[PDB]
Amino acid sequence: RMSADAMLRALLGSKHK
Amino acid sequence: ASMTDQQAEARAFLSEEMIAEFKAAFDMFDADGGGDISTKELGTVMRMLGQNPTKCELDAIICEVDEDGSGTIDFEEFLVMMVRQMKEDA
Ligand SMILES: [Ca+2]
Ligand SMILES: [Ca+2]
């Protein structure tokens, strides 16, 4: 719950640009 | 019309790096695309990525997120949910 950067970084914003 | 500005400070409490990735599953999260995130929407992206938060698991967090007691995570509310666990430590 604390370090949720994993799931957050998993799919990632997927912006690229 | 004010109730809780915790969702606002959340975006400021976290770095831009967090916000960016924050919008990662933000899309896959919402199933209907016209409500909010529940206990089911959580285990979804959480189970199809790596995490494995059981029912009681997600229920524990959401219970702290929803200050009103709706069981649903709003837009900015998705940022405070982590803030209530991050700094939260004695
Ligand atoms: Ca939804
Ligand atoms: Ca709520």
PDB file of all heavy atoms in Angstrom, chain A residues 2-17:
ATOM      1  N   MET A   2       1.959   1.222   0.749  1.00  0.00           N
ATOM      2  CA  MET A   2       2.867   2.360   0.833  1.00  0.00           C
ATOM      3  C   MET A   2       3.561   2.601  -0.503  1.00  0.00           C
ATOM      4  O   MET A   2       3.258   3.566  -1.206  1.00  0.00           O
ATOM      5  CB  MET A   2       3.910   2.131   1.930  1.00  0.00           C
ATOM      6  CG  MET A   2       4.900   3.274   2.079  1.00  0.00           C
ATOM      7  SD  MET A   2       6.459   2.749   2.818  1.00  0.00           S
ATOM      8  CE  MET A   2       7.512   4.141   2.413  1.00  0.00           C
ATOM      9  N   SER A   3       4.492   1.718  -0.849  1.00  0.00           N
ATOM     10  CA  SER A   3       5.226   1.836  -2.102  1.00  0.00           C
ATOM     11  C   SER A   3       4.470   1.161  -3.240  1.00  0.00           C
ATOM     12  O   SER A   3       4.808   0.052  -3.654  1.00  0.00           O
ATOM     13  CB  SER A   3       6.620   1.217  -1.960  1.00  0.00           C
ATOM     14  OG  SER A   3       6.544  -0.197  -1.884  1.00  0.00           O
ATOM     15  N   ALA A   4       3.443   1.840  -3.744  1.00  0.00           N
ATOM     16  CA  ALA A   4       2.637   1.307  -4.836  1.00  0.00           C
ATOM     17  C   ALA A   4       3.196   1.721  -6.196  1.00  0.00           C
ATOM     18  O   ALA A   4       2.534   1.561  -7.221  1.00  0.00           O
ATOM     19  CB  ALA A   4       1.194   1.765  -4.696  1.00  0.00           C
ATOM     20  N   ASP A   5       4.417   2.251  -6.202  1.00  0.00           N
ATOM     21  CA  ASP A   5       5.056   2.682  -7.441  1.00  0.00           C
ATOM     22  C   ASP A   5       5.158   1.526  -8.431  1.00  0.00           C
ATOM     23  O   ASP A   5       5.195   1.738  -9.644  1.00  0.00           O
ATOM     24  CB  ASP A   5       6.449   3.246  -7.151  1.00  0.00           C
ATOM     25  CG  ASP A   5       6.889   4.260  -8.190  1.00  0.00           C
ATOM     26  OD1 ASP A   5       6.265   5.339  -8.267  1.00  0.00           O
ATOM     27  OD2 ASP A   5       7.857   3.975  -8.925  1.00  0.00           O
ATOM     28  N   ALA A   6       5.200   0.304  -7.910  1.00  0.00           N
ATOM     29  CA  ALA A   6       5.294  -0.883  -8.750  1.00  0.00           C
ATOM     30  C   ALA A   6       4.141  -0.939  -9.746  1.00  0.00           C
ATOM     31  O   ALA A   6       4.347  -0.846 -10.957  1.00  0.00           O
ATOM     32  CB  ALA A   6       5.314  -2.138  -7.892  1.00  0.00           C
ATOM     33  N   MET A   7       2.925  -1.086  -9.229  1.00  0.00           N
ATOM     34  CA  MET A   7       1.739  -1.149 -10.074  1.00  0.00           C
ATOM     35  C   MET A   7       1.572   0.145 -10.863  1.00  0.00           C
ATOM     36  O   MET A   7       1.142   0.131 -12.017  1.00  0.00           O
ATOM     37  CB  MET A   7       0.494  -1.404  -9.222  1.00  0.00           C
ATOM     38  CG  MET A   7      -0.787  -1.512 -10.035  1.00  0.00           C
ATOM     39  SD  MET A   7      -2.230  -0.912  -9.136  1.00  0.00           S
ATOM     40  CE  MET A   7      -1.801   0.813  -8.918  1.00  0.00           C
ATOM     41  N   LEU A   8       1.919   1.262 -10.232  1.00  0.00           N
ATOM     42  CA  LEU A   8       1.811   2.567 -10.873  1.00  0.00           C
ATOM     43  C   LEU A   8       2.776   2.669 -12.051  1.00  0.00           C
ATOM     44  O   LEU A   8       2.459   3.276 -13.074  1.00  0.00           O
ATOM     45  CB  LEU A   8       2.101   3.678  -9.862  1.00  0.00           C
ATOM     46  CG  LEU A   8       0.882   4.190  -9.092  1.00  0.00           C
ATOM     47  CD1 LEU A   8       0.255   3.071  -8.276  1.00  0.00           C
ATOM     48  CD2 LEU A   8       1.272   5.354  -8.193  1.00  0.00           C
ATOM     49  N   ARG A   9       3.952   2.071 -11.898  1.00  0.00           N
ATOM     50  CA  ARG A   9       4.968   2.094 -12.945  1.00  0.00           C
ATOM     51  C   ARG A   9       4.786   0.934 -13.922  1.00  0.00           C
ATOM     52  O   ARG A   9       5.332   0.953 -15.026  1.00  0.00           O
ATOM     53  CB  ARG A   9       6.366   2.037 -12.327  1.00  0.00           C
ATOM     54  CG  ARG A   9       7.443   2.662 -13.197  1.00  0.00           C
ATOM     55  CD  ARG A   9       8.813   2.570 -12.542  1.00  0.00           C
ATOM     56  NE  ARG A   9       9.892   2.847 -13.488  1.00  0.00           N
ATOM     57  CZ  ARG A   9      11.160   2.497 -13.287  1.00  0.00           C
ATOM     58  NH1 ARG A   9      11.514   1.860 -12.178  1.00  0.00           N
ATOM     59  NH2 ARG A   9      12.080   2.785 -14.199  1.00  0.00           N
ATOM     60  N   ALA A  10       4.020  -0.075 -13.513  1.00  0.00           N
ATOM     61  CA  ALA A  10       3.773  -1.239 -14.358  1.00  0.00           C
ATOM     62  C   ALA A  10       3.307  -0.826 -15.749  1.00  0.00           C
ATOM     63  O   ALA A  10       4.055  -0.925 -16.722  1.00  0.00           O
ATOM     64  CB  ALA A  10       2.744  -2.152 -13.705  1.00  0.00           C
ATOM     65  N   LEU A  11       2.066  -0.359 -15.836  1.00  0.00           N
ATOM     66  CA  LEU A  11       1.500   0.073 -17.108  1.00  0.00           C
ATOM     67  C   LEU A  11       2.063   1.431 -17.523  1.00  0.00           C
ATOM     68  O   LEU A  11       2.138   1.745 -18.710  1.00  0.00           O
ATOM     69  CB  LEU A  11      -0.025   0.146 -17.011  1.00  0.00           C
ATOM     70  CG  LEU A  11      -0.704  -1.136 -16.526  1.00  0.00           C
ATOM     71  CD1 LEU A  11      -2.096  -0.834 -15.995  1.00  0.00           C
ATOM     72  CD2 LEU A  11      -0.765  -2.164 -17.649  1.00  0.00           C
ATOM     73  N   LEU A  12       2.456   2.231 -16.536  1.00  0.00           N
ATOM     74  CA  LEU A  12       3.011   3.554 -16.802  1.00  0.00           C
ATOM     75  C   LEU A  12       2.000   4.430 -17.533  1.00  0.00           C
ATOM     76  O   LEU A  12       1.067   3.927 -18.159  1.00  0.00           O
ATOM     77  CB  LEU A  12       4.296   3.432 -17.626  1.00  0.00           C
ATOM     78  CG  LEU A  12       5.568   3.895 -16.913  1.00  0.00           C
ATOM     79  CD1 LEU A  12       6.797   3.557 -17.743  1.00  0.00           C
ATOM     80  CD2 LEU A  12       5.503   5.387 -16.626  1.00  0.00           C
ATOM     81  N   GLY A  13       2.191   5.743 -17.452  1.00  0.00           N
ATOM     82  CA  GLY A  13       1.286   6.668 -18.110  1.00  0.00           C
ATOM     83  C   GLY A  13       1.132   6.377 -19.593  1.00  0.00           C
ATOM     84  O   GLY A  13       0.115   6.720 -20.196  1.00  0.00           O
ATOM     85  N   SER A  14       2.144   5.742 -20.178  1.00  0.00           N
ATOM     86  CA  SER A  14       2.117   5.404 -21.597  1.00  0.00           C
ATOM     87  C   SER A  14       1.926   6.655 -22.451  1.00  0.00           C
ATOM     88  O   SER A  14       1.084   6.684 -23.350  1.00  0.00           O
ATOM     89  CB  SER A  14       1.000   4.398 -21.882  1.00  0.00           C
ATOM     90  OG  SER A  14       1.422   3.415 -22.812  1.00  0.00           O
ATOM     91  N   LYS A  15       2.714   7.686 -22.162  1.00  0.00           N
ATOM     92  CA  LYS A  15       2.633   8.943 -22.902  1.00  0.00           C
ATOM     93  C   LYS A  15       3.647   8.968 -24.041  1.00  0.00           C
ATOM     94  O   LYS A  15       3.320   9.340 -25.166  1.00  0.00           O
ATOM     95  CB  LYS A  15       2.870  10.144 -21.974  1.00  0.00           C
ATOM     96  CG  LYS A  15       2.692   9.840 -20.494  1.00  0.00           C
ATOM     97  CD  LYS A  15       4.022   9.544 -19.820  1.00  0.00           C
ATOM     98  CE  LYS A  15       4.954  10.746 -19.866  1.00  0.00           C
ATOM     99  NZ  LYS A  15       4.244  12.015 -19.544  1.00  0.00           N
ATOM    100  N   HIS A  16       4.881   8.572 -23.735  1.00  0.00           N
ATOM    101  CA  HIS A  16       5.953   8.550 -24.727  1.00  0.00           C
ATOM    102  C   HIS A  16       6.342   9.963 -25.146  1.00  0.00           C
ATOM    103  O   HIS A  16       7.457  10.413 -24.884  1.00  0.00           O
ATOM    104  CB  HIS A  16       5.536   7.736 -25.955  1.00  0.00           C
ATOM    105  CG  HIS A  16       6.631   7.581 -26.964  1.00  0.00           C
ATOM    106  ND1 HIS A  16       7.964   7.776 -26.667  1.00  0.00           N
ATOM    107  CD2 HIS A  16       6.587   7.252 -28.278  1.00  0.00           C
ATOM    108  CE1 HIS A  16       8.690   7.573 -27.753  1.00  0.00           C
ATOM    109  NE2 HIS A  16       7.879   7.254 -28.743  1.00  0.00           N
ATOM    110  N   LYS A  17       5.419  10.660 -25.800  1.00  0.00           N
ATOM    111  CA  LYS A  17       5.668  12.024 -26.255  1.00  0.00           C
ATOM    112  C   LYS A  17       6.049  12.929 -25.088  1.00  0.00           C
ATOM    113  O   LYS A  17       5.768  12.553 -23.931  1.00  0.00           O
ATOM    114  CB  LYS A  17       4.433  12.582 -26.964  1.00  0.00           C
ATOM    115  CG  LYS A  17       3.908  11.683 -28.072  1.00  0.00           C
ATOM    116  CD  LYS A  17       2.389  11.704 -28.134  1.00  0.00           C
ATOM    117  CE  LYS A  17       1.769  11.008 -26.931  1.00  0.00           C
ATOM    118  NZ  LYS A  17       1.632   9.541 -27.145  1.00  0.00           N
TER     119      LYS A  17
END
